[PDB]
Amino acid sequence: AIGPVADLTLTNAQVSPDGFAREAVVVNGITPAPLITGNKGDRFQLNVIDQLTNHTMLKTSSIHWHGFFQQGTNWADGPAFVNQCPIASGHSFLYDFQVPDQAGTFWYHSHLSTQYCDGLRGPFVVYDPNDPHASLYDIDNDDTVITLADWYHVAAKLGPRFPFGSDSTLINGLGRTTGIAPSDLAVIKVTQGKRYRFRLVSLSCDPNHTFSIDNHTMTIIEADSINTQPLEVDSIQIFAAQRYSFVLDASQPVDNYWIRANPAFGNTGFAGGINSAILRYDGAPEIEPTSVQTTPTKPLNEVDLHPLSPMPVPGSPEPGGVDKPLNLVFNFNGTNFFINDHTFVPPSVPVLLQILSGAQAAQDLVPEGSVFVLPSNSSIEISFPATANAPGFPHPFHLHGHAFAVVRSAGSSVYNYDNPIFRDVVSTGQPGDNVTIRFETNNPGPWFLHCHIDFHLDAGFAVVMAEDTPDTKAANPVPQAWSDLCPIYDALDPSDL
Amino acid sequence: AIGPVADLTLTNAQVSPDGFAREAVVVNGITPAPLITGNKGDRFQLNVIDQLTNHTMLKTSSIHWHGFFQQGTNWADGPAFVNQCPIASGHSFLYDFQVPDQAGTFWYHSHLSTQYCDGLRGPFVVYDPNDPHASLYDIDNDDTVITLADWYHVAAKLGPRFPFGSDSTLINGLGRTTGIAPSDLAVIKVTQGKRYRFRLVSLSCDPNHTFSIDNHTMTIIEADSINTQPLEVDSIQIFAAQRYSFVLDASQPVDNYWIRANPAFGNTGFAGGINSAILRYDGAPEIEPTSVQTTPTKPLNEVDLHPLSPMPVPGSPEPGGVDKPLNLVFNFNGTNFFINDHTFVPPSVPVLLQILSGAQAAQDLVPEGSVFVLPSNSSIEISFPATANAPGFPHPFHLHGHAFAVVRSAGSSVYNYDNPIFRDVVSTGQPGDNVTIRFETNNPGPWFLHCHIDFHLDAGFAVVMAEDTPDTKAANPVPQAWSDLCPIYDALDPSDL
Ligand SMILES: *[C@@H]1O[C@H](CO)[C@@H](O[C@@H]2O[C@H](CO)[C@@H](O[C@@H]3O[C@H](CO[C@H]4O[C@H](CO)[C@@H](O)[C@H](O)[C@@H]4O)[C@@H](O)[C@H](O)[C@@H]3O)[C@H](O)[C@H]2NC(C)=O)[C@H](O)[C@H]1NC(C)=O
Ligand SMILES: *[C@@H]1O[C@H](CO)[C@@H](O[C@@H]2O[C@H](CO)[C@@H](O[C@@H]3O[C@H](CO[C@H]4O[C@H](CO)[C@@H](O)[C@H](O)[C@@H]4O)[C@@H](O)[C@H](O)[C@@H]3O)[C@H](O)[C@H]2NC(C)=O)[C@H](O)[C@H]1NC(C)=O
Ligand SMILES: *[C@@H]1O[C@H](CO)[C@@H](O[C@@H]2O[C@H](CO)[C@@H](O[C@@H]3O[C@H](CO)[C@@H](O)[C@H](O)[C@@H]3O)[C@H](O)[C@H]2NC(C)=O)[C@H](O)[C@H]1NC(C)=O
Ligand SMILES: *[C@@H]1O[C@H](CO)[C@@H](O[C@@H]2O[C@H](CO)[C@@H](O[C@@H]3O[C@H](CO)[C@@H](O)[C@H](O)[C@@H]3O)[C@H](O)[C@H]2NC(C)=O)[C@H](O)[C@H]1NC(C)=O
Ligand SMILES: *[C@@H]1O[C@H](CO)[C@@H](O[C@@H]2O[C@H](CO)[C@@H](O)[C@H](O)[C@H]2NC(C)=O)[C@H](O)[C@H]1NC(C)=O
Ligand SMILES: *[C@@H]1O[C@H](CO)[C@@H](O[C@@H]2O[C@H](CO)[C@@H](O)[C@H](O)[C@H]2NC(C)=O)[C@H](O)[C@H]1NC(C)=O
Ligand SMILES: *[C@@H]1O[C@H](CO)[C@@H](O[C@@H]2O[C@H](CO)[C@@H](O)[C@H](O)[C@H]2NC(C)=O)[C@H](O)[C@H]1NC(C)=O
Ligand SMILES: *[C@@H]1O[C@H](CO)[C@@H](O[C@@H]2O[C@H](CO)[C@@H](O)[C@H](O)[C@H]2NC(C)=O)[C@H](O)[C@H]1NC(C)=O
Ligand SMILES: *[C@@H]1O[C@H](CO)[C@@H](O)[C@H](O)[C@H]1NC(C)=O
Ligand SMILES: *[C@@H]1O[C@H](CO)[C@@H](O)[C@H](O)[C@H]1NC(C)=O
Ligand SMILES: [O-][O-]
Ligand SMILES: [O-][O-]
Ligand SMILES: [Cu+2]
Ligand SMILES: [Cu+2]
Ligand SMILES: [Cu+2]
Ligand SMILES: [Cu+2]
Ligand SMILES: [Cu+2]
Ligand SMILES: [Cu+2]
Ligand SMILES: [Cu+2]
Ligand SMILES: [Cu+2]
Ligand code: NA
Ligand code: NA
Ligand SMILES: [Zn+2]
Ligand SMILES: [Zn+2]
Ligand SMILES: [Zn+2]
Ligand SMILES: [Zn+2]
Ligand SMILES: [Zn+2]
Ligand SMILES: [Zn+2]
Ligand SMILES: [Zn+2]
Ligand SMILES: [Zn+2]
Ligand SMILES: [Zn+2]
Ligand SMILES: [Zn+2]
Ligand SMILES: [Zn+2]
Numbered sequence A, B: 001a002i003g004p005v006a007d008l009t010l011t012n013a014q015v016s017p018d019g020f021a022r023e024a025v026v027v028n029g030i031t032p033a034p035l036i037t038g039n040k041g042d043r044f045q046l047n048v049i050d051q052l053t054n055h056t057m058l059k060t061s062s063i064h065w066h067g068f069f070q071q072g073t074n075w076a077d078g079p080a081f082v083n084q085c086p087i088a089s090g091h092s093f094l095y096d097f098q099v100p101d102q103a104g105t106f107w108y109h110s111h112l113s114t115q116y117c118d119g120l121r122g123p124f125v126v127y128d129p130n131d132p133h134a135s136l137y138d139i140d141n142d143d144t145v146i147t148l149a150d151w152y153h154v155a156a157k158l159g160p161r162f163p164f165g166s167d168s169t170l171i172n173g174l175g176r177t178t179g180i181a182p183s184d185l186a187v188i189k190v191t192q193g194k195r196y197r198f199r200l201v202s203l204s205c206d207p208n209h210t211f212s213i214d215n216h217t218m219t220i221i222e223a224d225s226i227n228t229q230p231l232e233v234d235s236i237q238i239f240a241a242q243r244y245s246f247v248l249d250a251s252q253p254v255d256n257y258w259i260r261a262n263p264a265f266g267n268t269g270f271a272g273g274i275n276s277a278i279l280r281y282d283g284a285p286e287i288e289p290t291s292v293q294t295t296p297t298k299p300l301n302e303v304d305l306h307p308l309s310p311m312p313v314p315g316s317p318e319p320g321g322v323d324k325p326l327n328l329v330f331n332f333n334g335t336n337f338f339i340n341d342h343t344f345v346p347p348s349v350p351v352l353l354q355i356l357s358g359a360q361a362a363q364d365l366v367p368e369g370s371v372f373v374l375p376s377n378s379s380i381e382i383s384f385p386a387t388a389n390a391p392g393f394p395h396p397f398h399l400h401g402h403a404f405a406v407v408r409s410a411g412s413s414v415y416n417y418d419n420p421i422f423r424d425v426v427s428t429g430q431p432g433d434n435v436t437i438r439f440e441t442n443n444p445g446p447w448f449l450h451c452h453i454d455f456h457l458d459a460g461f462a463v464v465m466a467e468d469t470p471d472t473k474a475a476n477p478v479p480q481a482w483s484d485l486c487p488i489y490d491a492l493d494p495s496d497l
């Protein structure tokens, strides 16, 4: 790997990760983008150098560092027109943030329109030299990150507004398509007798995936950067933008075993070795697995996850037991999603800049009705009741700036106010569900809250949770370079966006 | 009403059933098309006079008489390029068929592309002078037919390939839109103390509807033209192309009560009186209801329906207990649906004409792989396992030429080989379901089997069940007028289709 200090150069290039050549957005010459690493406490200084030349995939860009709280550096969070104006082609912009109090598996991606789907996405790991789970595994390194990515042969802006799944699923940036000539599968090497911490990261633009490894079980020790009690499972449904670490004990006979990541829809199954990669024990022949899958007997259920460290749920143990309860009503009108009867339209002036300029009340912030102003140091409860009025469910919603307690998970009618998992992306399930979260407002600034299906986000499925507006300016000093972004951006010709 | 002998003139016209004026396809100057009636045993002679002028809504046409078996008149069934070539504009074509052995609630619609969605659809009732349910009701007439229709402001060929619901729901051809000026609601008049046989018919192009009447229950006595044991319910989910008769006892206080037909998706609910009509007791003021709905305590479940007359299930009481078992595998690739890896593409030469010309084996019939050849006088079992690979579920599949036993309903894991309902359209449910039907091949000819969501049909979600190919010509003599259709049609300029 690279980091915690690194240049990240954005270019357009031809890639063929599934055998099919297409133009993409790449970072330091690759997609998925390079693994960034550091250790808990590190200061990351990631200098984003925009050399993009292709307007169809957007020459402007903005990067979000998914999972990091950005406390005191809200201007670095990334969402275009919420936390910054986009960077322009031929300019650079330094993200500079510290990670005092987190460690785990993260990722980073474009947060402008659907650009991450065209390739600007990769994994990001912060190691804990005092990891409480260290004794559970031997080996944890660049070679134990596993990324999943949906890959499309037609560019995000050129295909359907809402594609029906992708052409291939890439595991560690490789995967096969339905087509006559099989391309190369990714191979993840292990030595028999060792235990691995695999760090599974969904870089998906849209579908969720069901991930399993033939003949092996997986002990989950982390979810979305939060340490968990160990939970042994044999299958994991992982939604866009989620992470898990799981320990794999390579204690099976030296062989090749299929690693499977079956998307929820699109080109499903494993015919011809699609949606697959290869776990290869050292000394197994260099051929495809012939291992066989079985029906899971212990599939992951989110209600079975619990934080390793006690993490009290904000507020009091009843529906509405908090300072500010919010129920989000989803709708859709064929082209745009809505939350409480508003589709998000990104404003000219980034929300953070509006707030720094003196707009502190919801009524004064734009887009009107999509920006919620929350009091500081308070408990918040948000429910996302699923509905057929919001197709493409289950929508995985993501809240910037925090980890939330999932007091009610999809597929469950239990409320858990005791020891629920905390995470940052949560499936909001299917009609009948009423997935409910809590968090405390301990992080002054405007934070995005949106579906992480990037096609839905781009069609307006988002609101902004602006907490502690009166202390936002003091809490989040902006660097001059950040103040320069809007004047550069607003000067661009439309053909250079 | 009109029939059993009638002219049905097809024109284009401007209509505004929900307050919004648009060009449509109308029959005898109206949409929904006029109620056709006769009595069991009648010979229907429906002369379809095509005076359509608008190519965007198709100037050619073909009509199907939904629910009728057409035994010995397969050439009259209607599906374009399965049973006939379309009629041309400036020509007429006589459908002439008998109904010796059926009576109940039916409907008729264009069976060319998506034309019925642009307005060519209406109800069709065959009364039974010896109806076994006659003593259950007092009044059964033109005024007790209730039709449901999804209505779109943009024409079928001009809007989305797969629309997200309709703009309004019309009940008896009237209904409101979301818009500032409420248009007129339909009013269904009853006199207190009388009992009505209401004949509910879904003319839907796509969504299913949940139908209820405030303060009243509904005793189902017929499903898809099959008499049932009486089943009292307080809500009915009715899928596209299904019918029910239910008896309503007008025994509530003289008032206005809301009639509700809530589509599965689109503009849902009842704000502003959308998706509604008015049951008005004679002497109630001429105003909107203020009645209130309640959660159903006895919603219809299909497994609760049973034929009034014992109807033995074909074959023997186990999975695969039949002469020819068939499992249909659904898929979708973003624009086209597939069944067993074939999308239906309608052939130049109608399937029936191919068969009359001497093609009798599946291998010789086109489109290859979409035409199944079934032996005569045999038991057939077909399963339609639901899958996310076929979005837009639950798909209501329809089999021409017969009524089938629904041995396994959606939402149910029971197999009923004893007294299951027989019907002709069945919801194939949601992933997890494996809806299964049986029928006997007692009706020589090619019969269509397809999703009755018209957008899906048009995107290829259909196969042809060609039974008794060797006796099809003998069983189904064709009139000269029918033999003339293809030469007229094949001579048309493309701008006159
Ligand atoms: C800027 O970024 C754009 C988005 O990535 C690039 O868009 C590309 O634009 C080209 C030219 O219009 C499109 O070309 C189409 O490609 C297919 C070819 O597909 C292949 O078909 C067989 C099998 O499927 C394949 O093996 C052959 O090699 C073909 O390449 C054609 O069917 C179309 O007629 C047309 O050629 C690309 O599809 C499109 N790319 C994407 C990813 O959407 C644009 O080229 C970029 N600008 C520059 C300077 O690179
Ligand atoms: C043949 O059949 C076609 C399909 O029905 C007809 O297609 C029509 O084509 C016209 C002209 O291109 C389209 O016109 C568009 O209509 C809307 C107007 O909508 C209304 O907007 C407000 C509120 O929404 C409304 O109250 C006003 O009265 C407007 O009428 C415009 O927004 C577009 O710019 C354009 O005018 C029709 O939409 C389209 N109809 C349908 C049903 O899709 C075609 O006219 C027919 N040929 C003949 C000779 O009648
Ligand atoms: C999903 O969960 C949310 C949050 O629990 C539900 O919204 C809440 O619904 C409750 C129950 O109706 C409302 O409770 C209150 O009840 C009292 C007593 O009648 C009433 O006086 C209050 O005005 C209120 O109705 C509560 O207000 C509401 N909370 C919020 C923040 O809106 C929601 O209905 C659930 N949605 C689904 C589809 O399950
Ligand atoms: C939906 O239901 C259909 C029909 O029941 C299922 O297809 C049938 O699947 C069964 C069970 O696997 C097959 O049974 C047979 O088992 C014997 C014993 O192993 C085997 O030797 C036979 O070759 C056969 O596999 C049966 O063939 C098959 N029937 C047909 C017509 O294909 C289907 O799997 C169900 N789908 C879902 C998703 O539930
Ligand atoms: C991995 O697991 C599979 C199935 O769980 C193993 O195959 C089973 O092994 C038992 C014990 O030998 C056999 O008796 C069963 O017939 C097998 N079950 C099935 C469903 O095939 C398999 O050998 C293991 N290893 C590989 C490489 O697949
Ligand atoms: C769905 O809702 C969106 C947002 O209301 C509609 O988009 C707006 O439509 C009006 C009329 O064109 C414009 O004033 C805005 O510029 C639109 N915003 C957009 C397009 O992002 C959209 O047209 C609605 N779609 C349908 C099919 O009704
Ligand atoms: C129709 O039914 C509703 C509700 O089922 C009636 O309202 C209920 O009537 C009881 C008896 O008077 C009241 O005590 C309850 O408060 C009502 N329940 C609810 C949910 O409101 C209603 O009066 C009936 N008639 C009309 C025209 O709505
Ligand atoms: C989905 O499948 C359909 C049917 O296979 C594809 O349509 C065919 O595509 C090829 C290439 O254009 C043609 O030879 C046929 O004429 C097409 N039939 C049609 C368009 O009805 C369709 O292109 C596939 N769609 C996608 C997005 O892959
Ligand atoms: C915020 O408010 C609580 C009261 O609920 C108060 O006791 C405390 O001092 C504040 N907490 C923090 C962490 O600043
Ligand atoms: C068809 O076949 C059955 C045998 O299963 C035979 O007994 C009978 O004569 C035939 N039935 C009819 C109705 O023609
Ligand atoms: O992550 O947005
Ligand atoms: O009915 O097709
Ligand atoms: Cu993210
Ligand atoms: Cu994020
Ligand atoms: Cu979504
Ligand atoms: Cu985000
Ligand atoms: Cu029909
Ligand atoms: Cu039919
Ligand atoms: Cu369908
Ligand atoms: Cu049909
Ligand atoms: Na809606
Ligand atoms: Na598929
Ligand atoms: Zn190039
Ligand atoms: Zn510049
Ligand atoms: Zn537990
Ligand atoms: Zn507003
Ligand atoms: Zn926080
Ligand atoms: Zn406890
Ligand atoms: Zn503060
Ligand atoms: Zn442009
Ligand atoms: Zn006109
Ligand atoms: Zn002519
Ligand atoms: Zn029963």
Ligand SMILES: [Zn+2]
Pocket: B342, B368, B369
């Ligand atoms: Zn074929």
Ligand SMILES: [Zn+2]
Pocket: B401, B402, B403, B439, B440, B441, B442, B443
């Ligand atoms: Zn029959």
Ligand SMILES: [Zn+2]
Pocket: B418, B419
């Ligand atoms: Zn019995």
Ligand SMILES: [Zn+2]
Pocket: B376, B444, B468, B471
């Ligand atoms: Zn025969």
Ligand SMILES: [Zn+2]
Pocket: B055, B494, B495
């Ligand atoms: Zn044309």
